Amino acid sequence: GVKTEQEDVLAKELEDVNKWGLHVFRIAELSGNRPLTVIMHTIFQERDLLKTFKIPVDTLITYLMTLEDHYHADVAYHNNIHAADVVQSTHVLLSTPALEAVFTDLEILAAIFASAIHDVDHPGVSNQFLINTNSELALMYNDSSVLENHHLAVGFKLLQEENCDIFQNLTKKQRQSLRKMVIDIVLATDMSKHMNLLADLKTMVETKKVTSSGVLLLDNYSDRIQVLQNMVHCADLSNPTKPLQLYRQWTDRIMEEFFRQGDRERERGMEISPMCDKHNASVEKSQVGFIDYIVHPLWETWADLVHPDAQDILDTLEDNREWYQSTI
Numbered sequence: 001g002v003k004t005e006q007e008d009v010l011a012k013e014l015e016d017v018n019k020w021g022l023h024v025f026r027i028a029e030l031s032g033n034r035p036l037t038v039i040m041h042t043i044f045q046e047r048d049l050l051k052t053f054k055i056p057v058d059t060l061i062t063y064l065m066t067l068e069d070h071y072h073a074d075v076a077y078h079n080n081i082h083a084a085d086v087v088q089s090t091h092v093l094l095s096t097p098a099l100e101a102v103f104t105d106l107e108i109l110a111a112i113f114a115s116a117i118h119d120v121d122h123p124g125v126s127n128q129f130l131i132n133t134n135s136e137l138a139l140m141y142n143d144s145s146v147l148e149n150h151h152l153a154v155g156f157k158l159l160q161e162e163n164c165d166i167f168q169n170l171t172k173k174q175r176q177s178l179r180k181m182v183i184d185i186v187l188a189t190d191m192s193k194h195m196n197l198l199a200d201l202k203t204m205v206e207t208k209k210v211t212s213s214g215v216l217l218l219d220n221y222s223d224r225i226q227v228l229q230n231m232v233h234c235a236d237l238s239n240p241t242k243p244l245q246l247y248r249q250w251t252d253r254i255m256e257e258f259f260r261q262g263d264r265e266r267e268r269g270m271e272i273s274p275m276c277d278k279h280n281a282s283v284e285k286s287q288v289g290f291i292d293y294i295v296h297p298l299w300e301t302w303a304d305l306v307h308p309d310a311q312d313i314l315d316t317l318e319d320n321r322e323w324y325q326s327t328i
């Protein structure tokens with residue numbers, strides 16, 4: 001009835017679960033390639049989600065393992081480790097002082113659950129690849145947010161496997177609201193939606209209202225969901241805000257995933273996608289443009305929303321940007 005030493009070492013790493021820069025890859029190793037399961041379990045227990053939503057523990061574990069099993073181990077970036085990272089990052093962002101007492105338990109559950117499932121069954125190629133190959137997935141979703149629609153459908157469908165229905169004790173009301181929020185959040189992870197999301201986030205920053213003491217004020221679904229969508233989108237694009245040792249591991253993986261798509265594209269005379277050509281790439285330059293044009297504007301805007309809780313995150317982002325730029 002006592003942990004093995006490896007379990008104890010895993011446990012000690014998991015004590016960083018509330019902090020930016022968790023050793024997520026070490027957790028993946030220590031857990032036997034169960035970072036999503038262990039980190040979700042730890043988070044649910046930390047936030048008392050099992051008791052609040054009456055989720056039987058074995059059902060939660062069975063669903064998590066099942067969810068995790070449907071991420072592809074042969075996918076360098078969009079895998080269970082990325083899922084785990086986004087979950088934990090969303091978890092940290094939920095706990096930002098500027099958002100204290102803003103969100104309900106159901107909204108908290110929605111953001112975390114959405115994070116966990118948001119990339120499930122990712123084949124490691126882009127929507128455009130799937131569209132251009134006339135893939136069954138593309139035809140299923142009429143070429144529109146193909147992967148993101150698929151991630152949702154899988155994440156929900158898996159609740160129907162043996163002893164996986166973690167929402168079995170929620171009321172119809174709770175389930176309908178949870179489901180709508182989850183769907184809105186994951187569809188907002190489609191990068192084609194980025195400019196619009198960010199514009200709306202800015203608009204809210206300009207017209208934001210604080211509150212008794214201090215803390216954002218969100219008094220309609222549109223505003224609450226938009227913040228959750230951006231929060232998870234921020235989590236999704238959080239790699240460059242992490243300590244360089246982490247960021248670089250992510251960059252290696254996404255680049256490996258991209259070049260592999262480029263290889264499959266070249267193999268069949270398809271035009272090679274941006275950043276996917278292993279022969280004509282500039283990893284450093286791509287990362288800088290990525291930060292300058294996407295990541296930094298997002299996080300700058302987010303940091304304004306929760307001023308000044310995200311200052312350290314922004315500073316890390318700029319340091320990493322300078323580092324990459326420093327390297328041609």
Ligand SMILES: COc1ccc(-c2cc(C)cc3c2O[C@H](C2CCOCC2)C=C3O)cc1OC
Nearest residue numbers: 126191192194236237254275286287289290294
């Ligand atoms: C217009 O949509 C996009 C805008 C920027 C990017 C983009 C551009 C650069 C230079 C680098 C990156 C990038 O997105 C990828 C990630 C791929 C999975 O979704 C989140 C972003 C990782 C980069 O390091 C990708 C987009 O589509 C996935």
Ligand SMILES: [Zn+2]
Nearest residue numbers: 118119147189
């Ligand atoms: Zn995705």
Ligand SMILES: [Zn+2]
Nearest residue numbers: 082118119236
């Ligand atoms: Zn993702």
